[PDB]
Design a protein around this ligand. Structure first.
Ligand SMILES: [Cl-]
Ligand SMILES: [Cl-]
Ligand SMILES: [Cl-]
Ligand SMILES: [Cl-]
Ligand SMILES: [Cl-]
Ligand SMILES: [Cl-]
Ligand SMILES: [Cl-]
Ligand SMILES: [Cl-]
Ligand SMILES: [Cl-]
Ligand SMILES: [Cl-]
Ligand code: NA
Ligand code: NA
Ligand code: NA
Ligand code: NA
Ligand code: NA
Ligand code: NA
Ligand code: NA
Ligand code: NA
Lengths: 105, 105
């Protein structure tokens, strides 16, 4: 109904990253989906500008766009990548790959 | 062309806040407009998940949405508000009201 985290399995070969990512083949990135219209939920954690823009968009829908459900906190994953030498190397904390929290911004 | 900060003057009476905000009558909130498609600019400061989602959306446009140009840093303003007593009170740093930086998230 509103801004929330939903599932999103990403295949690295489909996005053209299999050339430098050996493993894993796929991973769970999640995504943020849902509207930011009023009334909001108790755990949306919206900013005051997101609230203002939503109100302005309600009054002028053709001139001002809506606020967006977006990742507000990200989590790392581990990836096995080949470096310039070409040897499998483990990046233990490859930051910013998975959604931890969603929100209206 | 891409994700950037553009002007947005917000009238407090139009958004139904004039009941508790005496001054100012309007203020400059800015907004974030633009696409997040490739190729990106040098100052978009995108997250890796925003990059992954943009790639996945390119491959599956009907199943995965695009990343969004959103405020990544906010600035405060000062407002003159009437409190429960009804006396004009100055909120010097009313946080989160103006866009400082935009970005793809
Ligand atoms: Cl609400
Ligand atoms: Cl805020
Ligand atoms: Cl690491
Ligand atoms: Cl650790
Ligand atoms: Cl990293
Ligand atoms: Cl690029
Ligand atoms: Cl990141
Ligand atoms: Cl203050
Ligand atoms: Cl100060
Ligand atoms: Cl505040
Ligand atoms: Na995929
Ligand atoms: Na897939
Ligand atoms: Na309009
Ligand atoms: Na650990
Ligand atoms: Na306005
Ligand atoms: Na106006
Ligand atoms: Na598709
Ligand atoms: Na000051």
């Amino acid at each position: 109904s509103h801004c929330q985290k939903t599932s999103l399995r990403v295949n690295f070969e489909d996005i053209g990253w299999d050339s430098w990512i050996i493993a894993p083949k796929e991973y769970e990135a999640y995504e943020c989906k849902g509207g930011c219209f009023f009334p909001l939920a108790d755990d949306v954690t919206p900013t005051k500008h997101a609230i203002v823009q939503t109100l302005v968009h309600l009054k002028f829908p053709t001139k001002v766009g809506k606020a967006c459900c977006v990742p507000t906190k990200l989590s790392p994953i581990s990836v096995l990548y080949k470096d310039d030498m070409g040897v499998p190397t483990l990046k233990y904390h490859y930051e910013g790959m998975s959604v931890a929290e969603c929100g209206c911004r």
